[PDB]
Structure 1
Amino acid sequence: MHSDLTFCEIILMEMESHDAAWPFLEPVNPRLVSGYRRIIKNPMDFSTMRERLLRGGYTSSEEFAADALLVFDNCQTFNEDDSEVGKAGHIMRRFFESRWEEFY
């Protein structure tokens, strides 16, 4: 478990600092984005994961991964694949998948 929870910190810090992470650093502010409140049932972003991971609220490495994939599904649900946010999210999702397999 400790080996697992350590890899998540390596992964999230690399995601937090990735060039394409700029759409995921703080929660989407629905005041600024038409339709986001209606379309996305369960928001998630890197800061929410970082709080939860610090406070220690990830039982398993698979709970963490679930939160990561929820970020990118929300992104694909709300943003077109050729939008600025969309393009960035594909890079981040492919980065997460590629590096997550580098341990599991």
Structure 2
Amino acid sequence: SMHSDLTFCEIILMEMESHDAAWPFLEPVNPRLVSGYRRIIKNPMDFSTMRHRLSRGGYTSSEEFAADALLVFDNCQTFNEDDSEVGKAGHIMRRFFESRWEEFYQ
């Protein structure tokens, strides 16, 4: 399971999931709702996958956790136009994440 030293990451992820712009990213991108996603996006990521990975001990370090967070936002900007609803949400969430991360990494 998760080491207590990563509790700050668990909290950041909880706060991300609660954010008004998080709704696109809560669960894996759903083939029932959009086609051609995994054709393009070779490493899908979403907050529920991260939540389960963190809780089971699948992140040994905070850097591995942060890499998956950034993968959510990198995938979003690779697939979606910047002015689309999901594209805009990804930019909001990246800023929110990076602002929280910078409290710890400075």
8 Å contact kept, 2:16–2:97: yes
Shift of 1:35: 1.6
Percent sequence identity is 98
Q: Is the 8 A contact 2:38 2:44 kept in 1?
A: no
Distance in 1 between residues matched to 2:48 and 2:34, nearest whole Å: 19
Structure 2 Cα separation of the partners of residues 43 and 4 of structure 1: 26
Residue segments in structure 2 that go unaligned for 5+ positions in a row: none
Gaps of 5+ in 1: none
Cα 1:81/1:4, change in 2 over 3 Å: farther
TM-score (norm 2): 0.92
For the pair 1:31 / 2:35, whether they are aligned, the reply is no
Q: CA deviation at 1:61?
A: 0.4
Which of structure 1's runs of 4+ aligned residues deviate more than 4 A? Answer: 1-4
Aligned length: 104
CA distance in 2 between counterparts of 1:87 and 1:4 reads 32
Deviates more, 1:93-102 or 1:1-10: 1-10
Cα distance in 2 for residues equivalent to 1:50 and 1:57: 10
Q: TM-score, normalised by structure 1?
A: 0.94
Give the match's secondary structure for 2:64: helix
RMSD: 1.5
Task: Report the Cα distance in structure 2 between the residues aligned to 1:6 and 1:64, rounded to whole angstroms.
Answer: 11
